[PDB]
Structure formats: C-alpha cells, structure tokens
Amino acid sequence: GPLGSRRNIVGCRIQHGWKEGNGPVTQWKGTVLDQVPVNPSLYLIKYDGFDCVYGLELNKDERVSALEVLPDRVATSRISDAHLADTMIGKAVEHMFETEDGSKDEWRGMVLARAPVMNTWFYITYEKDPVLYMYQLLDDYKEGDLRIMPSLVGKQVEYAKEDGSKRTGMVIHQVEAKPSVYFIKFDDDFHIYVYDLVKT
Template identity: 70%
Template sequence: MKTPNAQEAEGQQTRAAAGRATGSANMTKKKVSQKKQRGRPSSQPRRNIVGCRISHGWKEGDEPITQWKGTVLDQVDERVLSLKILSDRVASSHISDANLANTIIGKAVEHMFEGEHGSKDEWRGMVLAQAPIMKAWFYITYEKDPVLYMYQLLDDYKEGDLRIMPESSESPPTEREPGGVVDGLIGKHVEYTKEDGSKRIGMVIHQVEAKPSVYFIKFDDDFHIYVYDLVKKS
C-alpha cells in the first residue's frame, strides 16, 4: 500500500461528503455539505442512491471541472455536477471477523505504507469508525496529516501492515491539553488560528463515538474533513 500522499498524487483520493454525519463518495481523502433541492416538488419518490457506484463532475471554485468515479456513502456534496448512476446498489461487504472490527475502532495504530523504491513508511494514527454501507472500510486519521482517510483496514491488519499500539503509548490524532470532553459542539461554527496568525472558519459536523473528545471539522475554504481532539482547558 502506498502512502496517503502518494495516493493523492495518483488521483485516488476519496472526498468525504459531510453533513451532520460523516459522509463521503468513495474516492481516498474526504469532506462535505448537504445538497439543496431546487425546482418544484415532484410526486415521484426520490431514488435512494446510497451504496450506488457513480460518476460525476467536481467543481472547486474557479478551477476546471474534474471527473470522478466512486461509491455514495451518505449525502452528496453541492459541488458534484452531472451525477450518473453507474450500476445497481453495491452489496455490503461482509467482514469475516466482526470482533476484529470492534477491536481496532478507537485504537491508536501504526499503519505501514509502501514508500518510494519499495521502502516502508510507517504512519501513526487512530481508527475512528467503520464506514456505512461498505463495512470493510474504516475511517482513520494520522498524526502527520489530521484529515479523514478511508482504508480497508482489516485486510491490512491480517497482512501485518496495521498494528495496534499498546494502550500506554496511545495518543490522539492531535496533541491534547489537560481538560475534559467538550459537549454540544455539533453544528457549531468554530474559528481556528493557524501558526502564521491567519484564521479559518469552519463547522463541527461529527463527534466520534469511540473517542468522544474527537470531532470532525469542515472548514469553509477546504473540501477536506479535519479531525481534532477538542478538550476544555483547565
């Protein structure tokens, strides 16, 4: 398996569609906003396309439209253009070891990727949750790059490319400060100050069930979903 950055360069990204739940179309890094309906109400029931393979155009600001193929996991981003259903609903993947899935969720892990010239590159991160519909896939974030990724982690675990770290060494996706869990943040707008002093405005869109102090944030100026550990300052 190649590093997340290498996969991004090859156009294998997965953009996550974010609403109040963790969304996405299955392409490798991710993020979202709910699509608004326009036009007159129709008496025809709207087809549920969750789980379907699709192709669509993607419009980001003033950049040219790019073409993508993927699988709908949740809501569809408003920047998706000319969406086409490619096939019938994708059958859910069956996990042979459900206990293993429960074991890795919420755990700090070391994930091995193939670097340049066959070298091994180890990324530390945290398994956040199991993806909807595609049960063999899991959401994960890394210390090196705290955005939302999606991988078939059970296969990697069985092949020895994913290792659960001892609990004594467990660390959250971002550096924590002493304090308690912050509740009631879903749907709240937040301001993030970067190292250079510039500010970003975003919205808290999801709380990780396995790690209640960890939240997903969608910033207005970026299509990725970021993962932060939010705690009250003591």
C-alpha cells in the same frame, strides 16, 4: 421530489465531472457514504482512487457537473473477522506504507469507526495528517502492515491561522468510540479534519 425518500443518494454509486480553475473536466467515480445531519446539503463520499473521504455539497458545488446517480446501491459485504474489526475501533495503530524505494514507513494513527455503506472499510486518521482516511484495515492487518497499540456537533468553528485570519467551518460529527474526537469541515475545502478537541 428528485433524490427524495427511497431515491436518497446515500449508499449509491455516483459519477460526475470535476473542474478546478481552467483545468480540464475530469470524471470522478465514487460511493456516497453519508449525509451530514447538521448540513443536509453536505455528503461524505469515498471516491475510487482517493484515500481521503471527501465532503462535497454535491448539488451546490460549482466544481461538480453532470452528476449521475447510478442504479447501483452498494451491498454490504461480510466482514472477514468480526471480533478483530470490533477490536480495532478506537485503538491507536501503527500503519505501514510502502514508498518508491520499497522502503516502508510507519505512520501513527487512530482507527475511528467502521465506514458506513462500505462496511469492510474503516475510518482512520493520523497524528501527522489529521484528516479522514478510509482503508480496508483487515487486509492491511493480514499482510503485516498494521499494528494495534495496547453538543459541539453543529457549532461554527474558527481556526486561528498564522496570518491573523480565521478559517471558518463547522463541527459535523462526534466519534462514538472516542467522543472527545470530532470531524470538522472547513468551508473552503473538502477534506474532513479529525481532532481531539482539548477544552481551553
């Protein structure tokens, strides 16, 4: 049936309307990176112009409208420096970000993996902002903006909010290079959280 077998949307360009509340419908365009094995309704998408990877149930989320699967399967690119790319995986990093002033701020983070499909991009998360980001880190490294420093999957989670309520979600991925680190998807939001889970 539709989007089955060889028509699987992973690896494809998509576009769709996006609407929140009574706001206007806007067009989102992106590349589908992955389908979550423990929740096959859930896809991971890199949207043009959004630095965070989003998890959306593309066929179920009422905010999504007019979904189009484009005739455009994203080809792999050749990595500019294979040894450097492999070396970054699992490392702590300091990632430089320029701002309004032109002042440049250094954010401590961890390189998680090469991104699927968009294979010159890297999964990365930050100590101060523990969700899943995606950047072409070899470019940033070349420009002097990156310094390299020297099963729970499928389980329901409940995060203890300060107001006494519990935020529900699911563990969706275990980071191969650092298997104490997991991706968590909360039911109420599309960011992918990335945490080193400390047993307690």
